[PDB]
RNA sequence: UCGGAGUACAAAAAACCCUCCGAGUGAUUUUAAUCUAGACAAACCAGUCAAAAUAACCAUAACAUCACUUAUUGAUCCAAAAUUUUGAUCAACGGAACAAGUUACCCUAGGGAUAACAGCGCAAUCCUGUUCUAGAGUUCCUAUCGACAAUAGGGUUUACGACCU
RNA sequence: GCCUAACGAGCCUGGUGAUAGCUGGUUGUCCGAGAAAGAAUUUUAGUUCAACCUUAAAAAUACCCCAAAAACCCUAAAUUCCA
């Protein structure tokens, strides 16, 4: 990560994150499973399903990704037609 | 002996494919499989040879 | 060298829930390499031979008589060679179901 | 061949009195790797009855068994599990008969 | 289980000799 | 560390020494039998039966019965031996056997059954359906006198009430024909109770039809305490059970206490405890016959509540408990996306300040 | 790298240039679907089970089977395919897209975390004694010796260990 | 070998505050708690995850735990689990 850029002196984002993850606004990150397109003939249908999932990352990973990612990506987004707008608030969480 | 990975196609006119390990010295493979689009048990005949 | 590759991690085969515990439907009660515990009442058997609860309730272990399925050649042979008084026993896991199946409520008074 | 203390190595019978057999057997016994003795039926039962009689005669209240089993002074920390059976009579491969 | 009174209840192989 | 078995270990009996000289069951079936007999004994280790509710297990039965019919053992035995000699003698019968053509005159078997072991079967069916559990609470009686109840569905139609059978409330709109066999020095009391379907009181029941001081087999001649009220389960709840009880009484009994008004369409007025009612008259009345049926809501019942009881009609559902979800975690790890929906309140977007 | 047994005696886990067997797949037809409560396992990545509900089929018809069945396997990117997939003795098997020797001509940074000298530990090897006598000594065990073995010491040798430098 | 007293490739200046997972060093006082290693890794002189731990904050049960309970040949000290 570049903490202070050369031209702007701001903090850069690591684009390699932005291609494989998704940040809901609650702070949860969402990712594909690994190896889900790989060698499908060789796998059980059950395993294949487990692979086709979208899954959530643990706290540590989340904080790591947040550090690797600038402020812009944490903003509240309203997209038209967006699949994921349903999931961006958190509900009934007693902690 | 070696086996082979063949791409098998539906005769239901629905493009659907599934790959199978098949004996190299055996005949062209044909099976009764499940096609998800038509939601039926249909005949699949091997279209292509994928991996050797 | 002569000896090679003895190195593999444990499989954590064990018994996950113990007698008297509460369980929710779908909990794995045990996992095993060979049949050690057999599934009893309200306990489903997986294809890897692990036992899971089919009902919410309380786990109980029990010794009980073993009468194999006649489609199984091996077991019926083992049973068939026994002296005339003897009975195979095995260890089973059950879940004594907790909640009642359902209730009757008053929807509307017409 | 493994040999645990208290095992008969060689058994001689005959119309002999014990004394001749004892005389030349003690040589053999002496050239064995462990300490050993030449014994008759009479000798053996003699030393066993003596072994138990010594242990019901004992004047001091404190015996290895009594202390070890009840874990007095937390002594089980310094003892091995096997000790519970051996009762301080056996230590390693050694065996002291005088130990009650 | 070795500690229990019910140990070896399932014990059979001594009844049938197949070797 | 070994423990010591408490009492006998199961196979400890047979000799392992010399296995060849021991007889085996080479049949799967013999084994199955022996095993099922072993599964019925009272073992000293935790067992299936113990946890899964043998329902009080051993129970000393308070018996309020009619005394068992006294018949000579040896005489009966001789007579049956002879009858079977006769029946086995004929060549016609044997022909009917080898050629697989024979029939049993079911009416006559139903007759003999009703006469002989019927009472016991009816008893255990009643125990099964827990008649005794909701009526006398501890008590088992054997139905010595057979009770024949029927309903008129039309001119030619007759719907019988056997023990446990299903009947529709349409059929039961009218009082039934009741038949049993007694000469007359006799006095009886007949009772129809709805074992469940009381609305307010879980432990109590409804008397539908109660009749008393019944000479012999004469049904209508008895003074009716409670006028016939047709079966009325509620739409939601399934299968209420109605019970016909028959009591042999000695002295004429009069009760102004239990007597009900002639129309009697009030529910508070028919509320009943068979136990209590029996406790009262216990000295004279001994329960003799029994017949009962299963009944579920059908169309005609709607007319009852509105027309007779002057009520709205209560309707019920069958409600299953809401599914169990673990505590929601701040960072659900390696969990599918649809996770967030399990804790969802209702499906609707909500824009808080927006 | 993966698995089975012992080590690791009874929940789990558990090391070694530890002891032993294996795997890098065949054969077969029963061609083994979609979706989802709850769990196991777990640093992460990966792995495992699985009810209900759908759809397929007898017209209330979902565990592929066998070889100890357990293991028969490989991430991203990137390439080929066009609809949906396939691709590594990437075997150094959590995988650098592609790189070998040699230095006594050597250099720097360090290390007694690690060798060569010496010390120290230990005593396999080595050396001393005693114990035991079958035997050699023509006869005779112990004048002189003494096999098979026994008990104890010494701390020269070669090692072994890597504790000071 | 020799190329201005150091040539396996001169010297000087600049690149330059080269870069060192390696060594050394790191400056007032007093008080509160307080740590020995499972996993990967051209990795075992290092990192990054766990488990511990520290500072705040919300809670509710936490250890200790008697019966009962956990395998098939033999098998100990004992574990697991719980009022
Ligand atoms: N087999 C294989 N090679 C790959 C993959 N990704 C990148 N490559 C690399 O791509 C290059 C292809 O050129 P090649 O040497 O095969 O002609 C190789 O250096 C190979 O290592 C992959 O997924 N599989
Ligand atoms: Mg192992
Ligand atoms: Mg390991
Ligand atoms: Mg000696
Ligand atoms: Mg008789
Ligand atoms: Mg766990
Ligand atoms: Mg299903
Ligand atoms: Mg590597
Ligand atoms: Mg590696
Ligand atoms: Mg790994
Ligand atoms: Mg790289
Ligand atoms: Mg030279
Ligand atoms: Mg040279
Ligand atoms: Mg240097
Ligand atoms: Mg050193
Ligand atoms: Mg070190
Ligand atoms: Mg030197
Ligand atoms: Mg040297
Ligand atoms: Mg020196
Ligand atoms: Mg040295
Ligand atoms: Mg020195
Ligand atoms: Mg020494
Ligand atoms: Mg001589
Ligand atoms: Mg020296
Ligand atoms: Mg040494
Ligand atoms: Mg060391
Ligand atoms: Mg110069
Ligand atoms: Mg520096
Ligand atoms: Mg390093
Ligand atoms: Mg230093
Ligand atoms: Mg410390
Ligand atoms: Mg690498
Ligand atoms: Mg950490
Ligand atoms: Mg206990
Ligand atoms: Mg507790």
DSSP-assigned states of every residue in F284-299 = T-EEEEEEEEEE---T
Find and list the nucleotides of strand G having atoms within 7 Å of a protein beta carbon.
Answer: 1-6, 8, 10-23, 25-28, 31-42, 44-51, 55-57, 62-65, 70, 73-77, 83-87, 131-133, 148-151
Tally of residues, chain A:
95
Q: Reduced to 3 states, what is the DSSP secondary structure of residue F22?
A: coil
> CB distance from F54 to chain C under 8 Å?
no
Nearest Cα to Cα of residue F233 among F197, F269, F270: F197
Cα–Cα distance list, F3 to C63, C92, E2 (Å): 17, 21, 8
Q: Indicate yes or no: strand G within 7 A of the C-beta of F325.
A: yes
- The rounded distance, in Å, linking the Cα atoms of C19 and C22 is 9
Cα–Cα distance list, C62 to C94, C98, F171 (Å): 8, 18, 49
> CB distance from F6 to chain C under 8 Å?
no
Q: Reduced to 3 states, what is the DSSP secondary structure of residue F274?
A: helix
**Which residue out of F27, F30, F32, F51 would a mutagenesis test of the C interface target, given it has the greatest number of C Cβ atoms within 10 Å?**
F51
- Cβ of C103 within 8 Å of Cβ of F318? The answer is yes
Q: Indicate yes or no: strand G within 7 A of the C-beta of C102.
A: no
Residue F277 burial by Cβ neighbours in a 10 Å radius (0-12, 13-18, 19+) = buried
Q: Indicate yes or no: strand G within 7 A of the C-beta of F320.
A: no
The structure tokens listed for A45 are 């249908």
Q: What is the per-residue DSSP string for F332-351?
A: -TT-BGGGGGTS-SSSS---
- The rounded distance, in Å, linking the Cα atoms of D66 and D72 is 9
For residue B6, what is the domain's CATH number?
A: 2.20.28.120
- The rounded distance, in Å, linking the Cα atoms of F47 and F40 is 11
The structure tokens listed for C54 are 């089919």
Q: Reduced to 3 states, what is the DSSP secondary structure of residue C52?
A: strand
Residue linked to tokens 């019920």: F316
- The rounded distance, in Å, linking the Cα atoms of B6 and B24 is 10
D85: nearest nucleotide, CA–C1' criterion = H76
Residue closest to sugar C1' of G47 by CA: A47
Question: How many CB pairs (< 8 A) connect A and F?
Answer: 47
Domain span at residue B7 reads 1-48
Residue linked to tokens 């017409």: C110
Bridge partners (DSSP) of residue A31 are A21, A55
Asked whether the beta carbons of D87 and D65 are under 8 A apart, the reply is: yes
The alpha carbon of residue F340 and the mean position of all alpha carbons in its chain are separated, in whole angstroms, by: 48
- Cβ of C80 within 8 Å of Cβ of F26? The answer is yes
Asked whether the beta carbons of F147 and F180 are under 8 A apart, the reply is: yes
Residue C46 burial by Cβ neighbours in a 10 Å radius (0-12, 13-18, 19+) = exposed
Q: Reduced to 3 states, what is the DSSP secondary structure of residue F165?
A: strand
- Residues 6 or more apart whose CB falls under 8 angstroms from that of F90 comprise none
The structure tokens listed for F337 are 């996306």
Cα D24 to ligand 23 centroid, rounded to whole Å:
21
What domains does chain C contain, in order, with CATH numbers? 1-110 (2.40.50.100)
- The rounded distance, in Å, linking the Cα atoms of F203 and F293 is 20
Cα D38 to ligand 23 centroid, rounded to whole Å:
29
- Cβ of F16 within 8 Å of Cβ of E2? The answer is no
Largest CA distance in chain F: 99
Phi, psi of C101 (to 5 degrees): -50, -40
Asked whether the beta carbons of A27 and A62 are under 8 A apart, the reply is: yes
Let me know if chains E and F touch, i.e. at least 3 Cβ pairs under 8 angstroms: yes
Sort out which chain E residues have CB atoms less than 8 A from C90's CB and list them.
10
Find and list the nucleotides of strand H having atoms within 7 Å of a protein beta carbon.
Answer: 49-50, 58, 67-82
The structure tokens listed for F319 are 């409600």
Q: Reduced to 3 states, what is the DSSP secondary structure of residue F152?
A: strand
Residue linked to tokens 């091997």: B46
Asked whether the beta carbons of B32 and B41 are under 8 A apart, the reply is: yes
> CA neighbours within 13 Å on the CB side: how many for D93?
6
Q: Reduced to 3 states, what is the DSSP secondary structure of residue F87?
A: helix
Sort out which chain A residues have CB atoms less than 8 A from B21's CB and list them.
41
> CA neighbours within 13 Å on the CB side: how many for F60?
0
Q: Which method resolved this structure?
A: cryo-EM
The structure tokens listed for A55 are 């899954």
Asked whether the beta carbons of F219 and F180 are under 8 A apart, the reply is: no
- Cβ of C63 within 8 Å of Cβ of E9? The answer is yes
E 1-19 residues, CB < 7 A, strand H: 1-14
How many domains, in total, are found in chain B? Answer: 1
């Amino acid at each position: 990560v570049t903490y202070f850029s050369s031209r702007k002196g701001k903090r850069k984002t690591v684009k390699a994150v932005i291609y494989r993850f998704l940040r809901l606004h609650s702070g949860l990150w969402l990712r594909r499973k690994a190896g889900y397109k790989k060698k499908l003939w060789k796998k059980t249908a059950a395993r294949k399903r487990r692979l086709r999932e979208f899954v959530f990352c643990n706290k540590t990973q989340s904080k790591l990704l947040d550090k690797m990612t600038t402020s812009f990506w944490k903003r509240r987004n309203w997209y038209a037609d967006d699949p994921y707008q349903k999931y961006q608030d958190r509900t009934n969480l007693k902690v | 002996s070696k086996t082979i990975l063949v791409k098998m196609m539906s005769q239901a006119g629905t493009g659907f494919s599934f790959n199978t390990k098949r004996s190299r010295l055996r005949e062209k493979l044909t099976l009764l499989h499940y096609d998800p689009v038509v939601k039926k048990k249909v005949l699949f005949v091997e279209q292509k040879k994928i991996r050797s | 060298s002569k000896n090679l590759g003895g190195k593999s991690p444990g499989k954590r085969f064990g018994i996950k829930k113990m007698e008297g515990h509460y369980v929710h439907a779908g909990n794995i009660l045990a996992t095993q390499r060979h049949f050690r515990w057999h599934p009893g009442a309200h306990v489903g058997l997986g294809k890897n031979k692990c036992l899971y609860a089919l009902e919410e309730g309380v786990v109980r272990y029990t010794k009980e008589v073993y009468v194999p399925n006649p489609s199984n050649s091996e077991a019926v042979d083992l049973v068939t060679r026994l002296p005339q008084g003897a009975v195979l026993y095995k260890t089973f896991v059950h879940v004594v179901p907790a909640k009642p199946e359902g209730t009757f409520k008053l929807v509307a008074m017409l | 061949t493994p040999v645990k203390a208290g095992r008969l190595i060689v058994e001689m019978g005959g119309r002999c009195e014990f004394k001749e057999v004892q005389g030349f057997l003690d040589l053999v016994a002496h050239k064995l790797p462990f300490p050993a003795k030449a014994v008759s039926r009479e000798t053996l039962e003699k030393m066993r009855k003596d072994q138990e009689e010594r242990e019901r005669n004992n004047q001091n209240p404190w015996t290895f068994e009594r202390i070890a089993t009840a874990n007095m002074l937390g002594i089980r920390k310094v003892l091995s599990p096997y000790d519970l059976t051996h009762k301080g009579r056996y230590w390693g491969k050694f065996y002291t008969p005088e130990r009650v | 289980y070795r500690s229990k009174p019910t140990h070896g209840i399932g014990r059979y192989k001594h009844l049938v000799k197949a070797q | 560390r070994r423990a010591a078995p408490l009492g006998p270990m199961p196979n400890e009996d047979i000799d392992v020494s010399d296995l060849e000289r021991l007889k085996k069951y080479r049949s799967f079936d013999r084994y199955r039998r022996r095993a099922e007999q072993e599964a019925r004994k009272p073992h000293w280790w935790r067992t299936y039966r113990e946890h899964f509710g043998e329902e009080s297990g051993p129970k000393d039965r308070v018996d309020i019965g009619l005394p068992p019919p006294k018949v000579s053992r040896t005489q009966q035995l001789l007579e049956r031996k002879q009858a079977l000699r006769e029946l086995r003698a004929n060549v016609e019968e044997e022909r009917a056997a080898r050629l697989q053509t024979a029939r049993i005159p079911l009416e006559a078997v139903r007759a003999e059954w009703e006469r002989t072991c019927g009472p016991y079967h009816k008893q255990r069916l009643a125990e099964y359906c827990g008649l005794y559990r909701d009526l006398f609470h501890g008590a088992t009686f054997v139905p010595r006198v057979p009770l024949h109840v029927a309903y008129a569905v039309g001119e030619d139609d007759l719907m019988p009430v056997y023990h446990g059978n299903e009947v529709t409330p349409t059929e039961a709109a009218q009082a039934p024909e009741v038949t049993y066999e007694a000469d007359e020095g006799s006095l009886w009391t007949l009772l129809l109770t709805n074992l469940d379907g009381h609305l307010l009181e879980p432990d109590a029941e409804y008397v539908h039809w109660l009749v008393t001081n019944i000479p012999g087999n004469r049904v209508t001649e008895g003074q009716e305490t409670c006028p016939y009220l047709p079966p009325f389960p509620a739409r939601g709840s399934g299968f209420h059970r109605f019970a016909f009880l028959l009591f042999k009484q000695d002295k004429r009994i009069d009760f102004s206490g239990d007597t009900r008004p002639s129309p009697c369409y009030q529910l508070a007025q028919r509320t009943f405890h068979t136990f209590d009612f029996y406790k009262k008259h216990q000295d004279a009345m001994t329960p003799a016959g029994l017949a009962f049926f299963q009944c579920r809501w059908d169309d005609s019942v709607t007319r009852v509540f509105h027309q007779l009881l002057d009520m709205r009609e209560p309707v019920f559902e069958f409600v299953r408990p809401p599914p169990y979800h673990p505590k929601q975690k701040r960072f659900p790890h390696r969990q599918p996306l649809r996770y967030l929906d399990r804790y969802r309140d209702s499906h609707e977007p909500t824009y808080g300040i927006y």
